Amino acid sequence: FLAKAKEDFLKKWETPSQNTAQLDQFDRIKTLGTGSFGRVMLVKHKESGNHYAMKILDKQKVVKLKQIEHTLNEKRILQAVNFPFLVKLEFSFKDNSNLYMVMEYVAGGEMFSHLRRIGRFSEPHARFYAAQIVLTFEYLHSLDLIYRDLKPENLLIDQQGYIQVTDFGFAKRVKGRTWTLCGTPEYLAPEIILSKGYNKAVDWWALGVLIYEMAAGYPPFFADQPIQIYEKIVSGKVRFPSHFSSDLKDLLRNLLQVDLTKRFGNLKNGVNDIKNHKWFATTDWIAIYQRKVEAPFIPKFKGPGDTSNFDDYEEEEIRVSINEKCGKEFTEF
């Protein structure tokens, strides 16, 4: 499949879809999550009744905060990728004030919500999710793409219990090393913190932080102010909970490696060093890709458009100025 996936990505990358719908065709039901440049809300298509998740971004704040190329890459890359664990973009448009990205609604909620309400996942439960992340990272790296925001708040469980990755806000074609300081402080790799110039190896570091937080219930490095979290990330020492496996401690010691000349995924053997680790000995990678494994946890679905698995946010009406702002900056959107 990876052989045919490269041509399809480049086909959708150069001939992207733009302006496929408008705001008047969508009823707005409930907010699913609030970011820094906008919000995501559950949305119902009036003519077809189908439900969707609409990510709204204010154009002025994006231009003001130097985020133009980041948002341009978000829409273009997500529109061009196709993998059984990536969220699918369905519509995209814009008006005088906002940009709109309409994705497929994932009613199961964030993995962060279920992680906090349960405490932690057992090792086989956490291994079942990491296998999907490993397969997705192998796919995205085949296309020379980077995903610089792996965290449970960006991972949604679906109705089959499988992971759907969202939030492509920092995704970028990286043919070599990039330099942008971005991500989530708990999951930043040391080379990002020190402005050293990083490659695809940062995704594997973020995978080690994720496997840690799932199997323990808390991240390996956290503190009040983010400055102290950076101090713990670059220190090189990481302490493990006592109930952790020897097989899991070994894998995390290779993923949470500061020296990226000895970090798994960045070595000569690539993703095979991870998939062939002892901790993944009981993992049928083909069955996970084909989604033929009974999920350990399946969220409750009270019907279509059910928002139970999401938190309640302060609802705010969507309002557009009567003056178009930053029209020339978002031509390619």
């Binding site: 970011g35 964030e110 939030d167």
Partner: peptide, 9 residues
């Protein structure tokens, strides 16, 4: 505890 927001600077 609280949804960690991504950083840009």
């Amino acid at each position: 505890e609280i949804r960690r927001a991504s950083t840009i600077e």
